[PDB]
Amino acid sequence: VVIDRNLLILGKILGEGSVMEGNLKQEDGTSLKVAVKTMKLDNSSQREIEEFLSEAACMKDFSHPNVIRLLGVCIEPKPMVILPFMKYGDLHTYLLYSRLETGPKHIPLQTLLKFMVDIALGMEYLSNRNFLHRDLAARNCMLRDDMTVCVADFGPVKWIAIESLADRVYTSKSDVWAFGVTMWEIATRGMTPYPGVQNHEMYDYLLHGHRLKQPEDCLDELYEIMYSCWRTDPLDRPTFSVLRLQLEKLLESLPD
Numbered sequence: 446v447v448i449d450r451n452l453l454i455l456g457k458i459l460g461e462g463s464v465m466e467g468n469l470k471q472e473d474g475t476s477l478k479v480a481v482k483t484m485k486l487d488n489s490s491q492r493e494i495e496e497f498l499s500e501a502a503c504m505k506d507f508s509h510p511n512v513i514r515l516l517g518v519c520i521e522p523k524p525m526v527i528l529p530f531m532k533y534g535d536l537h538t539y540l541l542y543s544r545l546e547t548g549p550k551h552i553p554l555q556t557l558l559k560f561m562v563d564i565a566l567g568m569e570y571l572s573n574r575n576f577l578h579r580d581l582a583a584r585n586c587m588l589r590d591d592m593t594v595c596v597a598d599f600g601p602v603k604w605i606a607i608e609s610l611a612d613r614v615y616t617s618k619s620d621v622w623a624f625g626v627t628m629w630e631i632a633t634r635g636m637t638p639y640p641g642v643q644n645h646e647m648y649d650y651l652l653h654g655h656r657l658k659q660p661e662d663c664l665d666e667l668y669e670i671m672y673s674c675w676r677t678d679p680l681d682r683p684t685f686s687v688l689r690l691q692l693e694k695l696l697e698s699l700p701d
């Protein structure tokens with residue numbers, strides 16, 4: 446997983462650890478445009494870095510068109526996660542530009558659902574290998590050059606599941622919760638979850654049975670899938686394999 450630091454040239458800041466652009470000189474002699482995420486670990490012990498290196502070995506062997514690839518790691522002693530570059534950027538920002546001229550056109554419902562299928566397919570790939578994201582959101586979903594969504598940033602209380610707020614436990618269904626919110630952001634084209642509610646009022650809001658409201662133009666069939674991911678009991682929540690097929694079935698039922 447480790448790559449020689451001399452093969453990496455850094456540049457601008459893309460986000461703020463932090464994120465940086467760069468050029469990875471491959472083995473075939475060609476320079477590849479890549480993103481570089483810094484990692485602030487606790488160097489008081491080799492506990493965090495061990496788990497970081499273990500995941501890197503697995504995150505590199507992954508191969509799926511709806512899951513971001515991991516190129517390797519570079520040491521300066523801070524590590525740096527090397528990832529592919531995405532000129533189209535994240536999905537959340539793309540949804541905000543769509544509601545503005547000059548930028549993308551008004552995204553139809555058919556295109557919005559395709560994003561959900563991709564994300565679902567990405568999480569379905571990780572679920573089979575028992576890999577948790579623990580940070581699923583629209584801001585984390587990047588767009589490939591062929592306009593296909595891919596999950597990323599897998600090492601925000603309104604994205605965390607109710608059980609993960611009390612017992613602070615994280616299972617596969619905890620990502621289904623975040624996936625449910627992700628579907629809400631896409632349908633709403635970049636709205637912040639739970640308008641009117643603060644981050645410190647969430648645990649009591651959800652515990653009382655309240656959930657994210659249904660959008661104005663959102664179909665009743667889609668909200669049911671979105672609401673099924675927010676059920677109090679994680680066991681009652683569906684898996685990504687189910688959600689993936691449900692969205693595909695609803696997608697094909699629509700015209701072009």
Ligand SMILES: CCCCNc1ncc(C(=O)NCc2ccc(S(N)(=O)=O)cc2)c(N[C@H]2CC[C@H](O)CC2)n1
Pocket residue numbers: 457459460461464480513528529530531532533534535584585587597598
């Ligand atoms: C989780 C990391 C995602 C994988 N790598 C990645 N890819 C793209 C971006 C990004 O922001 N692209 C937009 C962009 C477009 C043009 C240029 S240019 N060539 O004009 O200077 C630079 C950037 C990216 N950065 C994001 C930073 C915030 C973070 O939350 C998500 C990723 N990362």
Ligand SMILES: [Cl-]
Pocket residue numbers: 453454455
């Ligand atoms: Cl450099």
Ligand SMILES: [Cl-]
Pocket residue numbers: 635636637
């Ligand atoms: Cl908004």
Ligand SMILES: [Cl-]
Pocket residue numbers: 638639640656657658659
């Ligand atoms: Cl709401």
